[PDB]
Amino acid sequence: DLGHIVKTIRCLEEEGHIDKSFAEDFLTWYSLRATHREVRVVKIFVETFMEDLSSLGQQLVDTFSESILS
Amino acid sequence: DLGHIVKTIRCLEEEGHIDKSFAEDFLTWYSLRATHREVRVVKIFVETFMEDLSSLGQQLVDTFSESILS
């Protein structure tokens, strides 16, 4: 979870939807003072995103592999 | 574009949908020998992903900001 949340927050930050400031605050909050249910809800959001990432990856691989190999 | 493609490929790699090997090959291919149309199609896939990232970011911010602030 924590590893997935950090990786996900990094993706967001790298494209400027959150500033480094919010990233830090989000992670400190998540780790220290997020209630058990708000963690469960964070996990849900991250899981949807993981599914979208899985899909893109499959798409890129499926669509371009043949070309990449030459 | 290129900056967005690299950032996007990094997100994928960080969660093991592609190995560092494919990342490198994908980027070299994209830059050097991807045809103009296959670039247009890559861009489309990346754009869908950018929309999914935008949404997650908004979701996290919208849902948790109040909590993060205390």
Numbering used by the authors:
A (entry chain A), B (entry chain A): 532 to 601
The article reads:
The Arabidopsis VEL proteins are accessory proteins that interact with PRC2 to nucleate and propagate silencing at the FLOWERING LOCUS C (FLC) locus, enabling early flowering in spring.
We thus identified RR>AD, a double mutant that remains predominantly monomeric up to high concentration. As for VEL1VEL, VIN3VEL floaters are exclusively observed with the WT domain, whereas RR>AD remains soluble without a tag up to high concentration (2.4 mM). VIN3VEL crystals also show protofilaments; however, these are invariably composed of dimers rather than monomers as in VEL1VEL. Indeed, dimers are seen in every single crystal, regardless of the mutant, space groups, or crystallization conditions. Interestingly, these dimers result from mutual domain swapping of H4 between individual VIN3VEL monomers whereby molecule A donates its H4 to molecule B in an adjacent VIN3VEL filament, and vice versa. To form filaments, individual VIN3VEL dimers either stack perpendicularly on top of each other in a “cruciform” fashion (in RR>AD) or they associate pairwise to form tetramers that, in turn, stack pairwise along the polymerization axis (in I575D). Our combined results from NMR and crystallography suggest that VIN3VEL can switch between two conformations, with H4 tucked under when monomeric or extended as in the domain-swapped dimer subunits of the protofilaments seen in the crystals.
